[PDB]
Amino acid sequence: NASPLKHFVTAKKKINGIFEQLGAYIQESATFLEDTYRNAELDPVTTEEQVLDVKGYLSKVRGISEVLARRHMKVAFFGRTSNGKSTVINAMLWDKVLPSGITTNCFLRVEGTDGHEAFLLTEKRSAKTVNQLAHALHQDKQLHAGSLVSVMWPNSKCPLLKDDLVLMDSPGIDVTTELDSWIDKFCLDADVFVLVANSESTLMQTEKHFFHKVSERLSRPNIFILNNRWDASASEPEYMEEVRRQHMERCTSFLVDELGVVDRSQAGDRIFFVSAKEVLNARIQKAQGAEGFQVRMFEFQNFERRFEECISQSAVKTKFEQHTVRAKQIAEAVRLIMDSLHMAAREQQVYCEEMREERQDRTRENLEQEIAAMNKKIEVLDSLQSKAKLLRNKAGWLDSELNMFTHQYLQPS
């Protein structure tokens, strides 16, 4: 079975698809309206506000097309540098992607590219090897913790990237580090937050404050707790069993009671005990070619899965909700303009028919000349009712199509 990120990858494809259909619908509607308004052999059935309103809708819809086709999922990692925040990301990308061991104090952003080698962004600085990446960051005195650097990584290497996932590494938390600017400047668009901690120590207060600010400011943030450095339990399995259950009770109370972001039932799908160092080494080994190993190796793969389910579900609902509602209300406006035009063309066709009845009450010279002109005009109006009624009904299709999307991908879960 396939990665849960396909849920996001597909829904973006559909919502991108609907907006292409909607753009073509307005383009055609704008064409039909403006040419109807321009024909000066009919009493006005449309006004120039309607034509311009629709031309505005055409521009707006093309504007939303650009932003939608760029939507992506975002996961941010926080914590102390020593707890392995950086190896965790490396483990999920199956590579040493971020400088680790002994790291720079700024925000890092990992996104994929179709090109087959790597570069930096703050221009297009090269970074072929991880030692190269550490130095480009080392030389540049100008960067700082509030700056944002993007690692643009080949997505043929990592399927996470191909599926429109962005990974963001935050600077290592310390006791007086000012996290206060962090959420508004960088994490407002983030779908899941990962606290990478250490199993046997209690969370820093500064860690806790940052994740409470996220709880207050954001709309149901999805918070995972990663307890790293857990390979110590290879040699003291009996003790670490006692310690796991104690820390599991700590993190749950933090998540369920202190923060309120998950009730007790889901808490186990949000708190994990793993060793990213082990997972990293193993996956390095696998591409090229201790005790309790498989159990810890399986927990990381399970956490990876539980995270990809969460991010894909939540990201779709958050990046597309407003754009679906906008499309539905644009389709409604264009549908009423055609509806107004269909009824005005009808009301004028009635007028012309009486004037044809009246003409046949008058003189005989040029009767059929004169009744041809009126019969020509009546046919245009009748044909206008046709195309307008068609344009009305397909706006309902768009309405039916977008409502299907809300039902499938925007239900409150």
Residue numbers in the entry: 25 to 126, 129 to 148, 153 to 319, 328 to 400, 706 to 756
Paper text:
We determined crystal structures of MFN2IM in the nucleotide-free and GDP-bound forms at 2.8 and 2.0 Å, respectively. MFN2IM showed much higher affinity to GTPγS and GDP compared with MFN1IM, and could efficiently bind to GMPPNP. Intriguingly, we observed calcium ions (Ca2+) associated with the HD1 of both nucleotide-free wild-type MFN2IM and MFN2IM(T111D), and one of them is involved in intermolecular contact. HD1 is connected to the G domain via the so-called hinge 2, namely Arg95 at the C-terminal end of α2H, and Lys357 between α5G and α3H. The four-helical-bundle HD1 is stabilized by a massive hydrophobic network. ɑ4H, which comprises large portion of the conventional HR2, is substantially involved in this network. The C-terminal tip of ɑ4H physically contacts the G domain.
Outer mitochondrial membrane (OMM) fusion is catalyzed by the dynamin-like GTPase called mitofusin (MFN). MFN2IM contains a G domain and a helical domain 1 (HD1). These structures explain how MFN2 uses a primate-only single amino acid variance and a tighter G interface, as compared with human MFN1, to allow for enduring GTPase (G) domain association even after GTP hydrolysis, a feature that is unique in the dynamin superfamily and ensures efficient membrane tethering.
